[PDB]
């Protein structure tokens, strides 16, 4: 399965429940019973999702801008409100809301951090988990083009770390590369899983995520309050172009 790309978004507790209503995350489970196994995880997942507070999180790992207030009262009185035009306001203005962008140590500690809080480390397997956690600052600083491959997560994990597998063949204790292959096939869908249908979702719920130039350049993080006051701009900007390019062109 395909890890796919980061780049108003449903909580994560919705987007869970969508695909566990809807989809299945795995074609590679050897019976119901290792199917129902992977379901109760998936169950407390949602509960913990339902239960997480992802603002104290935000507060504590990637607070807004001191300045936040300020920079949100210059946008009000650009759209609330004046009569004319003022691009060299807007130039400082936007220029300094693109400069509040989260660093990716802060977004990985956030991240991290509700991952541990709500994704149960016997889904991977105590240290297996811990490796997925490792892996998400590459993640995390990832540009637009580049991907990471599952075999860039399970070339450094263990099925023999997972617990809840069942060894439907009788491999396991005898056949060790043969329960291998066929368990790791599952131990790539559950990365999969984690990072396609939470660990996305988590990001896109909590920060507007976008480049600071052109399209595979630098990623970069913001807090929503801050791109809602860029929205905001451009919305002003965009009907400044609605009446100086129609009124005065008549
Ligand atoms: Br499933
Ligand atoms: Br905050
Ligand atoms: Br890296
Ligand atoms: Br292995
Ligand atoms: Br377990
Ligand atoms: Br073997
Ligand atoms: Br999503």
Same mark, same amino acid.
């Given at each position: 399965?395909?890890?796919?790309?980061?780049?108003?978004?449903?909580?994560?507790?919705?987007?869970?429940?969508?695909?566990?209503?809807?989809?299945?995350?795995?074609?590679?489970?050897?019976?119901?019973?290792?199917?129902?196994?992977?379901?109760?995880?998936?169950?407390?997942?949602?509960?913990?999702?339902?239960?997480?507070?992802?603002?104290?999180?935000?507060?504590?790992?990637?607070?807004?801008?001191?300045?936040?207030?300020?920079?949100?009262?210059?946008?009000?009185?650009?759209?609330?409100?004046?009569?004319?035009?003022?691009?060299?306001?807007?130039?400082?203005?936007?220029?300094?809301?693109?400069?509040?962008?989260?660093?990716?140590?802060?977004?990985?500690?956030?991240?991290? $951090? &509700?991952?541990?809080?709500?994704? *149960?480390?016997?889904? #991977?397997?105590? %240290?297996?988990?811990? @490796?997925? =956690? !490792?892996?998400?600052?590459?993640?995390?600083?990832?540009?637009?083009?580049?991907?990471?491959?599952?075999?860039?997560?399970?070339?450094?994990?263990?099925?023999?770390?997972?617990?809840?597998?069942?060894?439907?063949?009788?491999?396991?204790?005898?056949?060790?590369?043969?329960?291998?292959?066929?368990?790791?096939?599952?131990?790539?869908?559950?990365?999969?899983?984690?990072?396609?249908?939470?660990?996305?979702?988590?990001?896109?719920?909590?920060?507007?995520?976008?480049?600071?130039?052109?399209?595979?350049? $630098? &990623?970069?993080?913001?807090?929503? *309050?801050?791109?809602? #006051?860029?929205? %905001?701009?451009?919305? @002003?900007? =965009? !009907?400044?172009?609605?009446?100086?390019?129609?009124?005065?062109?008549?």
């Amino acid at each position: 399965k395909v890890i796919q790309e980061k780049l108003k978004p449903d909580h994560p507790q919705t987007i869970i429940k969508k695909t566990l209503l809807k989809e299945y995350q795995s074609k590679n489970f050897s019976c119901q019973e290792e199917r129902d196994l992977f379901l109760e995880f998936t169950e407390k997942i949602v509960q913990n999702f339902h239960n997480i507070n992802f603002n104290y999180l935000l507060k504590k790992f990637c607070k807004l801008p001191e300045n936040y207030q300020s920079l949100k009262s210059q946008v009000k009185q650009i759209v609330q409100s004046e009569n004319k035009a003022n691009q060299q306001s807007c130039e400082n203005l936007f220029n300094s809301l693109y400069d509040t962008e989260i660093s990716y140590k802060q977004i990985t500690n956030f991240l991290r $951090q &509700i991952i541990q809080n709500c994704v *149960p480390n016997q889904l #991977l397997g105590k %240290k297996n988990f811990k @490796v997925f =956690l !490792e892996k998400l600052y590459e993640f995390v600083q990832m540009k637009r083009f580049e991907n990471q491959k599952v075999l860039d997560y399970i070339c450094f994990m263990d099925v023999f770390d997972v617990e809840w597998f069942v060894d439907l063949k009788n491999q396991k204790f005898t056949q060790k590369r043969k329960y291998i292959s066929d368990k790791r096939k599952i131990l790539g869908d559950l990365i999969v899983f984690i990072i396609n249908k939470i660990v996305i979702p988590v990001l896109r719920y909590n920060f507007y995520i976008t480049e600071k130039h052109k399209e595979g350049s $630098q &990623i970069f993080y913001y807090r929503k *309050p801050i791109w809602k #006051l860029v929205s %905001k701009l451009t919305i @002003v900007k =965009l !009907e400044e172009e609605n009446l100086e390019k129609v009124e005065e062109k008549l």
